[PDB]
Write a protein that binds this ligand. Structure first.
Ligand SMILES: [Mg+2]
Ligand SMILES: [Mg+2]
Ligand SMILES: [Mg+2]
Ligand SMILES: [Mg+2]
Ligand SMILES: [Mg+2]
Ligand SMILES: [Mg+2]
Ligand SMILES: [Mg+2]
Ligand SMILES: [Mg+2]
Ligand SMILES: [Mg+2]
Ligand SMILES: [Mg+2]
Ligand SMILES: [Mg+2]
Ligand SMILES: [Mg+2]
Ligand SMILES: [Mg+2]
Ligand SMILES: [Mg+2]
Ligand SMILES: [Mg+2]
Ligand SMILES: [Mg+2]
Ligand SMILES: [Mg+2]
Ligand SMILES: [Mg+2]
Ligand SMILES: [Mg+2]
Ligand SMILES: [Mg+2]
Ligand SMILES: [Mg+2]
Ligand SMILES: [Mg+2]
Ligand SMILES: [Mg+2]
Ligand SMILES: [Mg+2]
Ligand SMILES: [Mg+2]
Ligand SMILES: [Mg+2]
Ligand SMILES: [Mg+2]
Ligand SMILES: [Mg+2]
Ligand SMILES: [Mg+2]
Ligand SMILES: [Mg+2]
Ligand SMILES: [Mg+2]
Ligand SMILES: [Mg+2]
Ligand SMILES: [Mg+2]
Ligand SMILES: [Mg+2]
Ligand SMILES: [Mg+2]
Ligand SMILES: [Mg+2]
Ligand SMILES: [Mg+2]
Ligand SMILES: [Mg+2]
Ligand SMILES: [Mg+2]
Ligand SMILES: [Mg+2]
Ligand SMILES: [Mg+2]
Ligand SMILES: [Mg+2]
Ligand SMILES: [Mg+2]
Ligand SMILES: [Mg+2]
Ligand SMILES: [Mg+2]
Ligand SMILES: [Mg+2]
Ligand SMILES: [Mg+2]
Ligand SMILES: [Mg+2]
Ligand SMILES: [Mg+2]
Ligand SMILES: [Mg+2]
Ligand SMILES: [Mg+2]
Ligand SMILES: [Mg+2]
Ligand SMILES: [Mg+2]
Ligand SMILES: [Mg+2]
Ligand SMILES: [Mg+2]
Ligand SMILES: [Mg+2]
Ligand SMILES: [Mg+2]
Ligand SMILES: [Mg+2]
Ligand SMILES: [Mg+2]
Ligand SMILES: [Mg+2]
Ligand SMILES: [Mg+2]
Ligand SMILES: [Mg+2]
Ligand SMILES: [Mg+2]
Ligand SMILES: [Mg+2]
Ligand SMILES: [Mg+2]
Ligand SMILES: [Mg+2]
Ligand SMILES: [Mg+2]
Ligand SMILES: [Mg+2]
Ligand SMILES: [Mg+2]
Ligand SMILES: [Mg+2]
Ligand SMILES: [Mg+2]
Ligand SMILES: [Mg+2]
Ligand SMILES: [Mg+2]
Ligand SMILES: [Mg+2]
Ligand SMILES: [Mg+2]
Ligand SMILES: [Mg+2]
Ligand SMILES: [Mg+2]
Ligand SMILES: [Mg+2]
Ligand SMILES: [Mg+2]
Ligand SMILES: [Mg+2]
Lengths: 68, 275, 100, 114, 88
RNA sequence: UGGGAGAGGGUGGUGGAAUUCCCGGAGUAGCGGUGAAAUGCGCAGAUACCGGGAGGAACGCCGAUGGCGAAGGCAGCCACCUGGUCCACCCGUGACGCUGAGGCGCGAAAGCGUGGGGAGCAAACCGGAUUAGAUACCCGGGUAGUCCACGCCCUAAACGAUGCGCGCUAGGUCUCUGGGUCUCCUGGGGGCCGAAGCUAACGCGUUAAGCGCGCCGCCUGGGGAGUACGGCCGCAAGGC
């Protein structure tokens, strides 16, 4: 179920693309590991950097309560 | 910077003086000075009502503009920054475009050549005066009025400032230089910035004489006196206090609060001072 | 001159004239700081992931610009000053890094 | 008297406290290992959390409580058992959300935690 | 930073013949440009020790080149430092 | 000349999580803490829960057997200033190189001066336990300090216990970052396993502890002792 797969061409430096980005967060808000995103080193780093910008902007959350 | 001295006499060893680096004009504006009536600490009865004062350098009083809401919208150029013997802060010479000249206390950062202004629409920049209700919460501010139109009373000493912490109805809430938290009225003027000459506190007088120049006459311990004079007086040899340490007039002086209890402004002071 | 992408968030409970007004302060400043506007994209209201100024929503602006390197910082300050401006974030502009 | 509400479970290694609140969040009642009768470390146990959540839900029902939302903070040994008990109580449990507080590396912990 | 343009002017200003890059002269002159900027930068960021090391390295480098150039052709050296205001 | 990666450094801004305290609300008999407890806190209304506020400090996930730096070391995000370094092109200089006694700079923590700052933590210190005792370990408190600016100190298991540069001597697998004709090849880093060889052994092995040249530093039985004396440095502690 690797996330990089379930998407087309997309931008890792694109911090406003909330719809793409939010898929890389666990349901608890955490940036997901490489085992679940399927990114390389290089890409995964830009992923993290832009998710981080995004939360600053209001677009992505910093944390989410876990439901059952 | 404070200025040091080589120990070429015993006192120069620890004496430090201000650097006066900000000073650009070494003579007061003749129409803005007036004589200071030196008091000695004596009141109108002739009686000393404040001890140990007298004998300092002569001074001309520089008339300061602690209102400022007096000339809303009329900008002025900062002509010079000058020495003012009546306060720790330096003072700034204002040339209003009007042609009127006034002094203000010089905020840290004020540059000669620059422009300042007062009123509800003044830019939130250093040197400008506005009612408190128009100043962004969080900004640090000085020369604050305590009641509308009554003149700057808060944060005037070298290096001081208050910071606006938030608002509440007709009032804003300031943190005073003491750390006291107080509601001041929103309509009160305040000038953005802190007061300048912040190194003032690091000056070391260095010798008995320099206090003497400041008009501060020697201060004498109750212990060095006799019982007619002071609660601590007398006793054979040196003596410990032998009672709770007191003022010449007998009131206790380590800890006893003294602010009047039922005072109307209590309603407006949110938190007494720190530390 | 270098390219940056100014992001701005405004009070979501303004009327359209207040908002136009803020934009006027904003556009003056961009110009005053020698910013030359290029693209511009006003997606307006949009729900936030968390509250900013104790309020679930934000009014989003965005301006690809070209300005003097020195003035970018001072501008962000002048941008942030207004009690209605709730975030500014001025990012050095960059070439998209593509996946898939 | 209120129909729907909240149940918070504070589960630490030492105890379980359960307080039931109204919809706006204000407590109607609370209970804990101590309230149900234990002192010391026994308070920390799963049986402790059970009696606690029951007594908390029992007290809530007599104020009309019927459906609750369950909020869980802690990783104590009384945690999961505390939830069991709320379900089996006679209360609805529309949800179970974990809002355990964790810092994004904040204050330095006490020494026991390093 | 230094602008590519400013680099050229210097490269051009110093070059021994048209296409010249990396002769001793150009080498020394380009260094002097990075030197003086760092020197300046450090005047404000006195607490930037890491960059200061680099400064030292460059100063070192420029020095070797200058010693080489002085060995091979005094006139060219004397003129170079006179043109860049260097030995103190 | 064109490109790259990165917690490399400095300045300025700035975001959310948590803790603490204050304010409001609601609520009652305990909370907390341990191996178990007690001190402590709590009917003068604590704990737990909601909303508001203040403040300092550190930046969860990403995060790695990862990266960057000469080392110490460096981690939210943003911009500015700035160093190192690698690649590709094979364009320029024409041995301009290596090392380096002295010198100069940098140098974790603790410590020190002046002034800030102080939420959490916590030497000293108070008290509770444990115990034969318990100046400890564990529990409740707690001041320096931890944080900032500027100036000092100059140590270390400052470690790879491995000085720097160059050349030469099988490969296998993992990884980071470039350039390719992109299966695969070629650089520069970081790990493992190993040819030859080394080595007292343990182990090292193209990141040599192998085979060689250059330069530097250092060792010469254990203790006494990194002490004494002298000298130089330091505000002191103390350092050499
Ligand atoms: Mg002196
Ligand atoms: Mg002198
Ligand atoms: Mg001197
Ligand atoms: Mg003398
Ligand atoms: Mg003397
Ligand atoms: Mg001055
Ligand atoms: Mg000065
Ligand atoms: Mg005169
Ligand atoms: Mg006259
Ligand atoms: Mg006259
Ligand atoms: Mg007078
Ligand atoms: Mg009279
Ligand atoms: Mg008379
Ligand atoms: Mg008389
Ligand atoms: Mg008196
Ligand atoms: Mg007197
Ligand atoms: Mg003065
Ligand atoms: Mg002075
Ligand atoms: Mg003093
Ligand atoms: Mg005087
Ligand atoms: Mg005195
Ligand atoms: Mg005296
Ligand atoms: Mg006496
Ligand atoms: Mg006597
Ligand atoms: Mg008498
Ligand atoms: Mg008497
Ligand atoms: Mg008496
Ligand atoms: Mg006496
Ligand atoms: Mg006596
Ligand atoms: Mg006596
Ligand atoms: Mg006697
Ligand atoms: Mg005696
Ligand atoms: Mg006597
Ligand atoms: Mg006595
Ligand atoms: Mg006494
Ligand atoms: Mg007595
Ligand atoms: Mg009053
Ligand atoms: Mg704002
Ligand atoms: Mg317990
Ligand atoms: Mg170099
Ligand atoms: Mg030379
Ligand atoms: Mg309360
Ligand atoms: Mg709260
Ligand atoms: Mg590593
Ligand atoms: Mg060639
Ligand atoms: Mg060397
Ligand atoms: Mg040396
Ligand atoms: Mg150090
Ligand atoms: Mg330290
Ligand atoms: Mg210290
Ligand atoms: Mg001490
Ligand atoms: Mg200190
Ligand atoms: Mg201090
Ligand atoms: Mg004890
Ligand atoms: Mg005992
Ligand atoms: Mg003890
Ligand atoms: Mg303790
Ligand atoms: Mg503590
Ligand atoms: Mg405390
Ligand atoms: Mg001290
Ligand atoms: Mg190590
Ligand atoms: Mg090494
Ligand atoms: Mg050693
Ligand atoms: Mg050894
Ligand atoms: Mg060496
Ligand atoms: Mg050797
Ligand atoms: Mg490769
Ligand atoms: Mg490639
Ligand atoms: Mg490295
Ligand atoms: Mg390799
Ligand atoms: Mg091996
Ligand atoms: Mg073999
Ligand atoms: Mg190999
Ligand atoms: Mg050997
Ligand atoms: Mg010996
Ligand atoms: Mg011997
Ligand atoms: Mg010694
Ligand atoms: Mg020693
Ligand atoms: Mg000695
Ligand atoms: Mg040594």
């Amino acid at each position: 179920a690797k996330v990089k797969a379930t998407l087309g061409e997309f931008d890792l430096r694109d911090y406003r693309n909330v719809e793409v980005l939010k898929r890389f967060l666990s349901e608890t808000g955490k940036i997901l590991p490489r085992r679940r995103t399927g990114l390389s080193a290089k890409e995964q780093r830009i992923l993290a950097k832009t998710i981080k910008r995004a939360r600053i902007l209001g677009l992505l959350p910093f944390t989410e309560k876990l439901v059952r | 910077a404070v200025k040091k001295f080589k120990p070429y006499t015993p006192s120069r060893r620890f004496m430090t003086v201000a650097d006066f680096s900000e000073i650009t004009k070494t003579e007061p504006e003749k129409s803005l000075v007036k004589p200071l009536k030196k008091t000695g600490g004596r009141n109108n009865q002739g009686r000393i009502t404040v001890r140990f004062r007298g004998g300092g350098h002569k001074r001309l009083y520089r008339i300061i503009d602690f209102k400022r809401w007096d000339k809303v919208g009329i900008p002025a150029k900062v002509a010079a920054i000058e020495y003012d013997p009546n306060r720790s802060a330096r003072i700034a010479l204002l040339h209003y475009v009007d042609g009127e000249k006034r002094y203000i206390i010089a905020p840290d950062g004020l540059q000669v050549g620059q422009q300042v202004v007062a009123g509800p629409d003044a830019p939130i920049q250093v040197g400008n005066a506005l009612p408190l209700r128009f100043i962004p919460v969080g900004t640090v501010v000085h020369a604050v009025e305590l009641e509308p139109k009554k003149g700057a009373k808060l944060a005037r000493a070298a290096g001081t400032s208050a910071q606006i912490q938030g608002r509440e109805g007709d009032y804003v809430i300031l943190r005073l230089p003491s750390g006291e938290l107080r509601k001041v009225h929103g309509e009160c003027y305040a000038t953005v910035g802190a007061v300048g000459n912040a190194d003032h506190k690091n000056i070391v007088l260095g010798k008995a004489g320099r206090s003497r120049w400041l008009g501060r006459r020697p201060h004498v311990r109750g212990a060095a006196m006799n019982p007619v004079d002071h609660p601590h007086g007398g006793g054979e040899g040196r003596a410990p206090r032998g009672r709770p340490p007191a003022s010449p007039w007998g009131w206790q002086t380590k800890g006893l609060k003294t602010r009047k209890r039922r005072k109307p402004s209590s309603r407006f002071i949110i938190a007494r001072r720190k530390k | 001159m270098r390219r940056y992408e100014v992001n701005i968030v405004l009070n979501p409970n303004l009327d359209q004239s207040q908002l136009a007004l803020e934009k006027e302060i904003i556009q003056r400043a961009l110009e005053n700081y020698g910013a030359r506007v290029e693209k511009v994209e006003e997606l307006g209201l949009r729900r936030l992931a968390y509250p900013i100024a104790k309020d679930p929503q934000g009014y989003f602006l965005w301006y690809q610009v070209e300005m003097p390197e020195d003035r970018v910082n001072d501008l962000a300050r002048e941008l942030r000053i207004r009690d209605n401006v709730r975030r500014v974030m001025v990012v050095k502009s960059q070439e998209p890094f593509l996946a898939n | 008297q209120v129909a729907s509400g909240r149940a918070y479970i504070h589960a630490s290694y030492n105890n379980t406290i359960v307080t039931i609140t109204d919809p706006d969040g204000n407590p109607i009642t609370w209970s804990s290992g101590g309230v149900i009768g234990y002192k010391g470390s026994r308070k920390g146990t799963p049986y402790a959390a059970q009696l606690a959540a029951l007594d908390a839900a029992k007290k809530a029902m007599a104020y009309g409580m019927q459906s609750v939302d369950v909020i869980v903070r802690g990783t104590g040994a009384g945690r999961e058992q505390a939830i069991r008990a709320l379900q089996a109580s006679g209360l609805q449990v529309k949800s179970i959300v974990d809002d355990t507080p964790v810092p994004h590396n904040g204050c330095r912990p006490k020494k026991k935690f390093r | 930073p230094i602008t590519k343009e400013e680099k050229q002017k210097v490269i051009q200003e110093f070059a021994r013949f048209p296409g010249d890059t990396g002769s001793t002269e150009v080498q020394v002159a380009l260094l002097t440009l990075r030197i003086n900027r760092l020197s300046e930068h450090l005047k404000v960021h006195k607490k930037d020790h890491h960059s200061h090391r680099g400064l030292l390295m460059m100063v070192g480098q420029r020095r070797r080149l200058l010693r080489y150039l002085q060995r091979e052709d005094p006139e060219r050296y004397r003129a170079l430092i006179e043109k860049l205001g260097i030995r103190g």
